[PDB]
Write a protein that binds this ligand. Structure first.
Ligand SMILES: *[C@@H]1O[C@H](CO)[C@@H](O)[C@H](O)[C@H]1O
Ligand SMILES: [Ca+2]
Ligand SMILES: [Ca+2]
Ligand SMILES: [Ca+2]
Length: 536
């Protein structure tokens, strides 16, 4: 297999509104982001996933884009963007632009010209209809919004202020590619293609994900954009099996670098139930099955897979699958080690490296996410009490991932110098902040640092195969094997003392959050024990 720069990279995702504020309005800035590039470089990340900073009414907080080639003035101007690119480049860090091309804002020029002047060419950039079907919006209600000015329903799989783009229109596609080339020529490191599995939509036939012309569109995109350059393109794929992932990310097909898939995330809720009917107790054997499926059936050279616990749309991994009290940091290290020592590109969400958690939202007002608000308003008149709803949201609501980045124990955790922040800062910033994590030599942060370094310096993380070992239910253990080399990874995914019935000859320790000698000797693991050792 022929390697690329991103085959040894670890990606750090920054949520701009909640990273660092430097003008005291309670919202994060581009300058705030640039001011922490030394911290990110110290962490050892190679690429930064930058959540949308484009012009937006912020209906879906940046994912309703009104202009792809302008910076929202709440984040600064284009000069700030270019400066961020430059300063990150100087520190060996590439910027990966988050991109939404399935739909735009309704305040985007294309749509404005489209519902005005229905004789425009922009009219066909969007999906217009006379006789709507039963397609529902992911954020609730119908997917068709009746515009009474033009007497036509337009398609929106998300909010009504997020009309879908018509990807059967090659001219629209062309303009998209024009924008992409615009950002590419600004010297970015790649793209995160959000929801990109939806561009092959045929709404008339009730087709959303995995369309028939999907990979043709992705091939066209590649050939017209990043296909010539050397960029990391990660696509978010909802309908994703290992074979589909192959179709997406096999280097021969000339489409994407890798996929971003949520099958293991699906274990956060009951089978085929809405994500609001959550499950705290993680089914670790199920996670073993899924992880093994994606580690084995996605062979080297035939595709590449992403490694992630959480992002801006998910609950922080500690609140859903980890520990938030006694073994908080230990559980965080355990999960980190567990995920990062598999094959693929690991993704770290901001604050995960210090082990941040979900926020204790008590009432509906202090929320912001349109998805949570819609779910709440529906469920309230659908037999659910406000307390049940608030519990469900406290567990699963996306706002839990969008609370300000906790840096220190200053005002607003050193995120902002304003009276209030756009979202509340979690009180645990008393204990959970970047300064304190940096001070402690053996903190979660340095575990992530060590993992990222091991990924940078050692080829086996890319080269070694994967073999699942038969352990206890809540014990996740595997082998990375390549040539003479054999690496054992052992992680106790439990709050309780578990069993380890194995004998190995330990040659050296690569990483450990506990006494691995004790665990190997007494054949039993303490809660959240995790290590990686080289064995003979
Ligand atoms: C993908 O796009 C959706 C819709 O704009 C947004 O809500 C998510 O946050 C993003 O990941
Ligand atoms: Ca600001
Ligand atoms: Ca009318
Ligand atoms: Ca102030």
């Amino acid at each position: 297999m022929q390697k690329h720069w991103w085959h040894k990279a670890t990606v750090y995702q920054i949520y701009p509104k909640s990273f660092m504020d430097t003008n005291g309005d309670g919202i994060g800035d581009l300058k705030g982001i640039t001011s922490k590039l030394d911290y990110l470089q110290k962490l050892g990340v190679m690429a930064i996933w930058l959540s949308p900073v484009y012009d937006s009414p912020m209906d879906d907080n940046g994912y309703d884009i009104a202009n792809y080639e302008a910076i929202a003035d709440i984040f600064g101007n284009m000069a700030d963007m270019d400066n961020l690119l430059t300063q990150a480049k100087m520190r060996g860090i590439k910027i990966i632009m988050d991109l939404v091309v399935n739909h735009t804002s309704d305040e985007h020029a294309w749509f404005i010209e489209a519902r005005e002047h229905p004789d425009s060419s922009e009219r066909d950039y969007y999906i217009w209809c006379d006789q709507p079907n039963d397609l529902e919006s992911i954020f609730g209600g119908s997917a068709w919004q009746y515009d009474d000015k033009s007497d036509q329903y337009y398609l929106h799989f998300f909010s009504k202020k997020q009309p879908d783009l018509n990807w059967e229109n090659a001219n629209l596609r062309q303009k998209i590619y024009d924008m992409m080339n615009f950002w590419i020529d600004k010297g970015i490191g790649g793209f995160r293609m959000d929801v990109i599995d939806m561009i092959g939509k045929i709404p008339a036939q009730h087709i959303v994900s995995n369309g028939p012309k999907l990979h043709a569109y992705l091939k066209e995109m590649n050939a017209a954009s990043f296909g010539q350059h050397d960029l990391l393109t990660v696509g978010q794929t909802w309908g994703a099996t290992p074979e589909i992932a192959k179709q997406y990310s096999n280097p021969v097909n000339h489409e994407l670098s890798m996929v971003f898939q949520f099958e293991h995330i699906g274990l956060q809720h009951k089978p085929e139930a809405p994500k609001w009917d959550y499950v705290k107790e993680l089914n670790v054997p199920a996670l073993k099955t899924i992880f093994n499926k994606w580690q084995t059936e996605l062979e080297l050279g035939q595709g590449w897979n992403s490694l992630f616990w959480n992002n801006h749309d998910l609950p922080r991994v500690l609140s859903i699958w980890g520990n938030t009290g006694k073994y908080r940091e230990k559980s965080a290290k355990a999960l980190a080690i567990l995920l990062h020592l598999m094959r693929g590109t690991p993704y770290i969400y901001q604050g995960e490296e210090i082990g941040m958690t979900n926020y204790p939202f008590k009432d509906l007002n202090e929320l912001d996410d349109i998805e949570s608000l819609n779910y709440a308003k529906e469920a309230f008149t659908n037999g659910k009490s406000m307390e049940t709803i608030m519990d469900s949201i406290r567990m699963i609501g996306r706002d839990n991932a969008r609370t300000p980045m906790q840096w220190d124990a200053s005002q607003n955790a050193g995120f902002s110098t304003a009276d209030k922040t756009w979202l509340p800062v979690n009180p645990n910033y008393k204990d959970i902040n970047v300064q304190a994590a940096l001070k402690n030599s053996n903190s979660i942060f340095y575990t992530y640092q060590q993992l990222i370094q091991l990924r940078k310096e050692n080829d086996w993380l890319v080269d070694a195969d994967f073999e699942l070992l038969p352990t206890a239910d809540k014990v996740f253990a595997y082998l990375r094997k390549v040539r003479e080399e054999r690496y054992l990874i052992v992680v106790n995914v439990s709050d309780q003392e578990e069993v380890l019935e194995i004998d190995v000859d330990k040659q050296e320790t690569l990483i450990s959050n506990t006494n691995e000698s004790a665990a190997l000797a007494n054949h039993k693991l303490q809660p959240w024990d995790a290590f990686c050792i080289k064995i003979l």
